[PDB]
Amino acid sequence: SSHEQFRAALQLVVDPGDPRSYLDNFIKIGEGSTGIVCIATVRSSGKLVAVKKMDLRKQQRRELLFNEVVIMRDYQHENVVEMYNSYLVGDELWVVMEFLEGGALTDIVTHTRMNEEQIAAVCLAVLQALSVLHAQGVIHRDIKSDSILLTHDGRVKLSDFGFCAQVSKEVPRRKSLVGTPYWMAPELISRLPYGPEVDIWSLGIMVIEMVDGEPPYFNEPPLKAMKMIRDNLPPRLKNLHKVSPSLKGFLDRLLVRDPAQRATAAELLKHPFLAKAGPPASIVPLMRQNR
Ligand SMILES: NC(=O)c1cn(-c2ccnc(N)n2)c2cc(C#CC3(O)CCCCC3)ccc12
């Protein structure tokens, strides 16, 4: 069976043993792509972690799990959710990771209005993560507000690498159709070989998400909106009156159809709009735990 082959392959990269021997008090906090995310306690230290458990028999692309456990293990960056361990518990792959108590960014963009200082803080954090990640040939391929987690004190970390991939000098592009439809880049939906630039476009969409509270064509069906992204010009902000010229100039360097002229993360780190970025304390009030 291909299933047992995949189990045995995971045993070569997964941490040995049973995690249920030092983790307890599972509190379900997330669902989705046939994988539940729980909060757990570490018996040794009492610290809290997040455990993503994915059933291997219910996956459209099992290989991506591979990616997530291989690319992200030993990865350390202040703006990236750190993975500590991974385990194979029966037919379930468990990923043990840092627990972000502040929740996701979607919860903020659907309930409140963010200012340009906070938007610039979020973007600076995401771009600092992305410059390193792309320098190592890692493409997140699912940049959206759901993939942004926060601490209680307002620190921003990138998360949900379940679609990520790696490119090299030998293999510099991907051709798979992954991501969430409304955030996908034009070259990606157009079945074109793409590189890290798709992460920039998606970041741009998230900026729209932080301005308008939703991505473009959110009302349309997924495939219809994907065709619209494929054919139409770069989408324009609905709440265009609320954004400063600096933010519009920043966003224009992100939502470029041609990936060759789309700005890179390293370039965007030099943009003046990110000077508006505030400290994590500026994100503290946006949190749901208050307001
Ligand atoms: N479905 C949900 O609701 C999720 C909730 N969290 C968390 C996690 C921690 N803290 C909070 N507050 N939420 C998720 C984390 C991921 C993930 C990931 C990685 O790729 C990140 C890099 C290292 C390997 C693993 C996927 C989904 C959810």
Short mmCIF file of N, CA, C and O and ligand atoms in Angstrom, two decimals, residues 29-32 35-37 50 52 68 72 80-83 95 97-104 149-150 158-162, ligand 1:
data_model
loop_
_atom_site.label_atom_id
_atom_site.label_comp_id
_atom_site.label_asym_id
_atom_site.label_seq_id
_atom_site.Cartn_x
_atom_site.Cartn_y
_atom_site.Cartn_z
N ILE A 29 -8.72 23.74 18.91
CA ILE A 29 -8.81 25.16 18.59
C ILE A 29 -8.89 25.40 17.08
O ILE A 29 -9.15 26.52 16.65
N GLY A 30 -8.64 24.37 16.26
CA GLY A 30 -8.70 24.57 14.83
C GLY A 30 -9.09 23.32 14.08
O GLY A 30 -8.73 22.20 14.48
N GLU A 31 -9.79 23.51 12.96
CA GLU A 31 -10.11 22.42 12.05
C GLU A 31 -9.68 22.82 10.64
O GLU A 31 -8.87 23.74 10.44
N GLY A 32 -10.22 22.15 9.64
CA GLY A 32 -9.91 22.48 8.26
C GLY A 32 -9.51 21.28 7.42
O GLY A 32 -10.21 20.27 7.39
N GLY A 35 -7.43 17.99 9.44
CA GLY A 35 -6.39 18.07 10.43
C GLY A 35 -6.79 19.03 11.52
O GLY A 35 -7.13 20.18 11.24
N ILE A 36 -6.77 18.58 12.77
CA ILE A 36 -7.21 19.40 13.90
C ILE A 36 -5.99 19.97 14.60
O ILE A 36 -4.95 19.31 14.71
N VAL A 37 -6.11 21.20 15.07
CA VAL A 37 -5.06 21.84 15.85
C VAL A 37 -5.57 22.00 17.27
O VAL A 37 -6.65 22.57 17.49
N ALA A 50 1.15 24.04 20.56
CA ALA A 50 0.10 23.69 19.63
C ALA A 50 0.48 22.40 18.92
O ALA A 50 1.62 22.22 18.50
N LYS A 52 -0.69 20.11 15.74
CA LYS A 52 -1.47 19.87 14.53
C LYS A 52 -1.43 18.38 14.23
O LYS A 52 -0.36 17.82 14.01
N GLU A 68 6.30 20.38 4.99
CA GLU A 68 6.14 21.12 6.23
C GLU A 68 7.06 20.58 7.33
O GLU A 68 7.70 21.36 8.04
N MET A 72 10.62 22.99 7.62
CA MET A 72 10.46 23.86 8.78
C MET A 72 11.16 23.35 10.03
O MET A 72 11.29 24.12 10.99
N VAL A 80 8.51 33.70 12.40
CA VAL A 80 8.00 32.44 11.88
C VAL A 80 7.66 31.55 13.07
O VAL A 80 8.45 31.45 14.02
N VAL A 81 6.49 30.92 13.02
CA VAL A 81 6.11 29.96 14.05
C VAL A 81 7.12 28.83 14.06
O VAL A 81 7.36 28.19 13.03
N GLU A 82 7.73 28.59 15.22
CA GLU A 82 8.77 27.58 15.32
C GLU A 82 8.14 26.21 15.55
O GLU A 82 7.23 26.07 16.37
N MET A 83 8.60 25.22 14.81
CA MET A 83 8.23 23.83 15.07
C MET A 83 9.28 23.21 15.98
O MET A 83 10.48 23.37 15.75
N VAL A 95 2.46 17.49 14.50
CA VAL A 95 3.47 18.54 14.48
C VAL A 95 3.30 19.35 15.76
O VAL A 95 2.22 19.91 16.00
N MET A 97 4.42 22.56 17.96
CA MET A 97 4.91 23.88 17.57
C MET A 97 4.62 24.89 18.67
O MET A 97 3.83 24.64 19.59
N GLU A 98 5.27 26.04 18.55
CA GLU A 98 5.01 27.17 19.43
C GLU A 98 3.54 27.54 19.39
O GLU A 98 2.90 27.51 18.33
N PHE A 99 2.99 27.88 20.55
CA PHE A 99 1.58 28.26 20.67
C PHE A 99 1.47 29.78 20.71
O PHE A 99 2.01 30.43 21.62
N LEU A 100 0.77 30.35 19.73
CA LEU A 100 0.55 31.79 19.63
C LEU A 100 -0.79 32.12 20.28
O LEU A 100 -1.85 31.84 19.71
N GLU A 101 -0.74 32.73 21.47
CA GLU A 101 -1.95 32.96 22.25
C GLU A 101 -2.82 34.09 21.69
O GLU A 101 -4.01 34.13 22.00
N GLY A 102 -2.26 34.98 20.87
CA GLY A 102 -3.03 36.11 20.37
C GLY A 102 -4.04 35.79 19.29
O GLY A 102 -4.85 36.66 18.95
N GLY A 103 -4.02 34.59 18.74
CA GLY A 103 -4.95 34.23 17.69
C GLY A 103 -4.44 34.62 16.31
O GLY A 103 -3.31 35.07 16.13
N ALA A 104 -5.32 34.43 15.33
CA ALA A 104 -5.00 34.73 13.94
C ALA A 104 -5.33 36.18 13.61
O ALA A 104 -6.02 36.88 14.35
N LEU A 149 -0.26 34.71 12.82
CA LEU A 149 -0.60 34.53 14.22
C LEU A 149 0.11 35.59 15.06
O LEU A 149 1.14 36.14 14.66
N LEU A 150 -0.46 35.88 16.22
CA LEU A 150 0.04 36.96 17.07
C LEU A 150 0.27 36.46 18.48
O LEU A 150 -0.35 35.49 18.93
N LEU A 158 4.56 34.35 11.07
CA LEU A 158 3.99 33.67 9.92
C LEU A 158 3.81 32.19 10.23
O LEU A 158 4.65 31.57 10.90
N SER A 159 2.72 31.61 9.74
CA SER A 159 2.32 30.27 10.13
C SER A 159 1.71 29.55 8.94
O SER A 159 1.59 30.10 7.84
N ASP A 160 1.33 28.29 9.18
CA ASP A 160 0.62 27.44 8.22
C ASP A 160 1.43 27.27 6.93
O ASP A 160 1.09 27.79 5.86
N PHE A 161 2.52 26.51 7.06
CA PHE A 161 3.36 26.18 5.92
C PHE A 161 2.93 24.89 5.23
O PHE A 161 3.73 24.29 4.52
N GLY A 162 1.67 24.48 5.41
CA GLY A 162 1.19 23.23 4.84
C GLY A 162 1.14 23.20 3.32
O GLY A 162 0.90 22.13 2.76
N1 LIG B 1 -6.17 25.38 11.89
C1 LIG B 1 -5.89 26.39 12.89
O1 LIG B 1 -6.78 27.01 13.36
C2 LIG B 1 -4.46 26.63 13.34
C3 LIG B 1 -4.05 27.22 14.53
N2 LIG B 1 -2.73 27.25 14.58
C4 LIG B 1 -2.05 27.77 15.61
C5 LIG B 1 -0.78 27.34 15.97
C6 LIG B 1 -0.15 27.93 17.05
N3 LIG B 1 -0.79 28.88 17.72
C7 LIG B 1 -2.00 29.26 17.36
N4 LIG B 1 -2.67 30.31 18.11
N5 LIG B 1 -2.62 28.71 16.33
C8 LIG B 1 -2.23 26.69 13.43
C9 LIG B 1 -0.91 26.47 12.98
C10 LIG B 1 -0.66 25.87 11.75
C11 LIG B 1 0.79 25.66 11.32
C12 LIG B 1 1.93 25.52 11.02
C13 LIG B 1 3.40 25.33 10.66
O2 LIG B 1 3.51 25.16 9.27
C14 LIG B 1 4.16 26.59 11.07
C15 LIG B 1 5.67 26.44 10.88
C16 LIG B 1 6.21 25.20 11.57
C17 LIG B 1 5.44 23.93 11.19
C18 LIG B 1 3.93 24.08 11.36
C19 LIG B 1 -1.72 25.46 10.95
C20 LIG B 1 -3.03 25.66 11.38
C21 LIG B 1 -3.28 26.29 12.64
#
